[PDB]
Symmetry: D2
Subunit: 303 residues, 4 copies
């Protein structure tokens, strides 16, 4: 009947000193709890293996490199893949990727989709890098993603994951209608990803109290307008003196929030997903082929 | 100047036999009340001069033509333009446009922007036509816009209206991120329009209770993601046996609803608008030039 | 750790001709699915064994009586209690109760709490009966609850159900702050019930589009202000030509909706419940003993 | 008359050294702007004449006393009353009240209603005092209202203000259903007040991101369940190193937010108010006399 149970594994803070081994234990616990509640897939946060290091300015490259993965999975993360296969629960894992190509140390904010067999089905590299590239003194904490990562080079792909068409977004990406639309046009039935969203907005502090609103607004609108189920897993709580947004969620193709976290700690939420529900939108009010007039959208793709 | 007061003139039902003269009296009343409350611009509904005729299956061309405007403004509508100039309040008026080219009739669902001097400074023709194409017997009311109108041929332009950059959308258009984005890329500071949205949708009645939700979600998301003020003027109430959605609104560039109607009759709402507020989004989180990666949005413009 | 998994079993329509045996099959299916997802308790709708008969005017007492239960459980409903005990999942069941006392045929809109052992722990009889008492011609459908039931005679009790303090409300009750507050003062940790809420409001049709809003507003506010988890199970869909509201939900003590249904059919939703979370409100902003000034609330209890 | 235009005058921060003369200039500006937009009544914040001093632990009584009013109005505040009478616009003003009885000082967190003739027609003293009673070292700022004020002794009265029945609440009061209900039972058509709500709460920081949610939820629910129009005027912005909540609002008797502020500075919002709108709730779903069962609400009034 094209049904499944989707889960989101929200993470509480990860300390700068907290080891990957310790984080994996936490991820394994949520994956196991999710499976016990019938979930067939669980979405984890953006950069879920470390503290959100872009908040600091690094002068030592070796120290910066320590936060990146040079292989996926390595011996430390391996246990998560083995448990996923064992319990038949796939997952979306976010991490910092370091790959040397043509003499260049390429750094990406990455996420991978692993199926219920523990196999990596697809990868995505964050295209919309927020923040800044140089240290900015007026900020109480930095957001140097433009400095520590380069824009993704895989576009916005949609993969077949256990008979479900899934697309990935990473944090800031969720706020751009273009990311959602490209994946919607590729037939995505589920669009998921994670995020590290501070509740304080240094550039525009007058928007601080709207942090939850803007995050949920983006998820609801993206789902509705593309007739896609969506899920966002945040890493929340007070991490290294910076409060991060919670409200991890699962959203229906109608834009209705069907599951929402209420704590700022490791938390699992689940929701029954019917892939055919996408038709209520994609065959009617949002029947792309019948209603879209692309000859008028050219400006969106102009360089 | 960067400050102004925006108004929305929601309309109650317009009967099939209600004359344009009677409708103009109603529009004049709202425009006058809005100006008395400081407004310098008022947004009126889609097809604001007649009942929403696309709900019927027409068999007589003369009858169909009777609901269109062959000139703008004609002697009957002219008074609205004269009062707008007198009180210094521009407006957005929706109407059915009938044009004859070399003996060939062209039909559009149209809206025009009139400045505080009563001069027409811009036009837009509905690009996203919703509904079905043929008569469907099971429906309590039809929605045959695809038969009675041709998709707009003016694209999604943005016009200068009394020191404000304004873009127009018409009803269904508000649900498409592409419409909003094109105008956002053209620098729109205010994106406005009207709508006739039945609270019942024959093919997907399971979404009926979400009518307000979907309407407001579309306005809030469009405003936020484009850092634009927006306004939607609905024609609400029980019109010719079909209940139409109210909840006309004015929205800030943050996606915050700053004004909302609560009746289903002619109703004026206003809100103070600071055109520089758009910068809170467009120079920061949604600084297009600095964050967008159009090279990866090509699919959106593919025919 | 005072934790559990709460479920809501929303019902789709129940036809006037649909038998209790058929309804029980549907209830058993949801209870089983809920248990498979880890739930320890499931909330069912108000009058969950029959169609919402108050919508019709009855002239035959025998016909009216057919919709009431004279024993709970009887041989037909028995299977549900046996399965609850088997799988270790308690439930809240709503039904029409007919009891003869002192020569009077007493009729109540009732709900019972059954623990994970299949034992009836407590009963509640609807105190706030909405609608009217006499046939009213202007209505497209009636709501004769005042005619078919008498106000409950058990007050608003709170019972110990498997180590959780649970209070019950029935439909309309959820809109009255008094119902919530009495149970809050009695220490309720979970307040639950069901409802049959038409999306059309005959007395005030201008509120039709606010049906979901008012229902969710009532649940969120009640939970927040009493620091109680809550759950509302609706019977939704087109039942005997009357559309009933869906949006069954589970709400945290903060008023946050943690689970929401998206269909208008039989649907199970679940949420992890931590009873100690109530303390975040009841020991702080809503620390009753420290902040309430009952000497000023007398008017609320005046007859 | 049953029609009027209600306004809310949100205040930006008031510095510790900012004089009442300077504050009155700011209040006069908003009152004048509101009247120019047709308003006949404007709601100002709680303790609208000074910085929110309860955030400090005082050690000098003279210093504490300096933040209170010993007369209302004194020569410095009188101009506001004179302008209100001149322009025909009443107001709700919050202030700290110091009364001396037989040499004994009485302190209240107070608000008064002034009609369009500039006459004081009603007073209310905050009954629900939030916060803590002793100095708590870990807090970045205190909230010692329980020490600086005595619970109000006037109950929750409802006054006639220019043909409108108005009731007052002060800040925290808006979160208690009892406050709203008493005024609802007294026939209030408009329930209004102001607030100083930090977006950070030291003892329960996990609710910080819900500050707007909880504030609006309280206003919407109170209005709906009592069929009353309501208005909340906040003093927002970064005041003495503490960020205060904005989102000042005007709400319809249906719980619908009809106007909302979007800045954290002095800001005026207005909305058309029809006093007969209250009937949509109070003569139907919330027809108190016909539906309430006070005999079962006794616990709410128990001391
Ligand atoms: C600096 S923009 C706001 C924060 C951003 N966070 C991430 N990780 O992308 C986000 O869009 O969620
Ligand atoms: C038939 S689709 C839903 C109704 C549509 N109305 C108009 N007028 O475009 C709208 O998008 O608002
Ligand atoms: C007639 S009042 C609106 C409908 C009412 N329904 C029930 N069952 O109580 C409710 O309050 O949900
Ligand atoms: C300390 S409780 C939260 C803050 C409180 N503020 C005031 N001024 O009452 C309020 O209820 O808005």
């Amino acid at each position: 009947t094209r049904q499944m149970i989707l889960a989101v594994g929200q993470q509480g803070p990860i300390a700068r000193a907290e080891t990957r081994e310790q984080v994996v234990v936490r991820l394994l616990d949520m994956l196991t709890k999710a499976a016990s509640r019938g979930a067939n897939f669980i979405v984890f946060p953006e950069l879920a293996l470390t503290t959100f290091f872009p908040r600091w300015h690094f002068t030592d490259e070796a120290e910066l490199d320590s936060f990146y993965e040079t292989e996926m999975p390595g011996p430390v993360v391996r246990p998560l893949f083995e448990k996923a296969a064992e319990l038949g629960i796939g997952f979306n894992l976010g991490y910092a990727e370091l790959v040397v190509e043509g003499g260049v140390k390429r750094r990406f904010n990455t996420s991978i989709l692993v199926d219920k067999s523990g196999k990596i089905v697809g990868k995505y590299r964050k295209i919309h890098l927020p923040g800044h590239k140089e240290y900015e003194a007026y900020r109480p904490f930095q957001h140097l993603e433009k400095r520590y990562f380069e824009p993704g080079d895989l576009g916005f792909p949609v993969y077949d994951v256990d008979a479900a068409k899934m697309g990935m977004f990473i944090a800031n990406d969720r706020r751009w209608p273009e990311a959602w639309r490209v994946m919607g046009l590729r037939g995505a039935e589920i669009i998921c990803g994670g995020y590290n969203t501070p509740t304080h907005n240094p550039p525009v502090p007058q928007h601080d109290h709207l942090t939850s609103f803007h995050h949920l607004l983006s998820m609801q609108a993206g789902s509705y307008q593309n007739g896609a189920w969506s899920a966002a897993a945040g890493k929340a709580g007070m991490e290294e003196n910076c409060m991060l947004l919670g409200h991890s969620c699962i959203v229906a193709p109608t834009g209705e929030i069907v599951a929402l976290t209420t704590t700022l700690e490791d938390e699992v939420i689940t929701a029954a997903v019917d892939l055919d529900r996408c038709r209520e939108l994609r065959e009617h009010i949002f029947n792309f082929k019948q209603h879209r007039q692309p000859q008028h959208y050219g400006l969106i793709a102009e360089l």
